[PDB]
A paper describes a structure:
The vaccinia virus protein A46 is one of a series of proteins preventing expression of host proteins that induce an anti-viral state. The A46 protein acts close to the plasma membrane by binding numerous TIR-domain containing adaptor proteins such as MyD88, MAL/TIRAP, TRAM and TRIF as well as TLR4 to prohibit further signal propagation. The VACV intracellular immunomodulators form a family of Bcl-2-like (B-cell lymphoma 2 like) proteins with low sequence identity but high structural similarity to the eukaryotic Bcl-2 protein family. Here, we report the crystal structure of the A46 N-terminal domain comprising residues 1 to 76 and demonstrate that this domain binds fatty acids.
Residue numbers in the entry:
A (entry chain B), B (entry chain B): 1 to 67
C (entry chain A), D (entry chain A): 1 to 76
The structure:
């Protein structure tokens, strides 16, 4: 189980993280202008995320894995 | 385990689905211009996806869940 | 193997996706209005689709290309 | 509780996220260059962050706001 986001580095990623009691889920929401990408996980899952810059493609990347 | 994508409905979502032998993963890649959002799953997971239009916000939505 | 499907935008396209180790196939089961499509193709082959809203006829449209060796079932 | 962290863009920010049922807290463990931040806050509180590339000083920047009742640990 993994996810990956890549955006042009002129853009800003608005990342929100919370645990919702009503949903009983860990939420990671990523917004890039009018586009949103959300992933949701159970209350006891560990998500390891890596934020980086790719110089060759001029992109910001976020990769998430379940270790 | 769930994901959700929302994009302004003037945009087109390029969704690619494949199983990679080298990664041993089911891949769902969604590209919206220069932004990409990929989710990856194990070889025997079922992903139920729903593609819809939200008239109030003028957005295309894709929601995926593991049933 | 190009395809183009559409539904009125008040409705939802529902696609179930999985890789079946026993069939050794990627399987997509799609519900499109009153219609079911079962699509099966091989590992390391891609289904490449474009999902859009057609403002001219108020539809959700999916257009794309299937691998050469694809099996398709249709039922209503 | 505003924050602003940065690393040279040749490096990676590594954030581990989980909700600990026993502590009844959302926990984020971040590695930022030579530094570790442990951040803990309550359910139904949001950490709202903005991740960008700063072309002027070649850094990855994360700026954002933490909930009022947040615990922060820092180690090098
Ligand atoms: C998560 C997005 C999945 C997109 C699934 C697209 C597959 C649609 C196949 C429809 C094939 C219909 C063929 C026909 O028109 O007779
Ligand atoms: C998946 C994205 C997660 C983003 C995590 C942002 C949390 C960063 C907290 C850093 C707090 C540092 C406080 C300080 O500068 O002393």
């Amino acid at each position: 189980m993994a996810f990956d986001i890549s955006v042009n580095a002129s853009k800003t990623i608005n990342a929100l993280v919370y645990f919702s009691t009503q949903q009983n889920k860990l939420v990671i929401r990523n917004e890039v202008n009018d586009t949103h990408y959300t992933v949701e996980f159970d209350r006891d899952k560990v998500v390891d995320t890596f934020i980086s810059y790719n110089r060759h493609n001029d992109t910001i990347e976020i990769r998430g894995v379940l270790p």
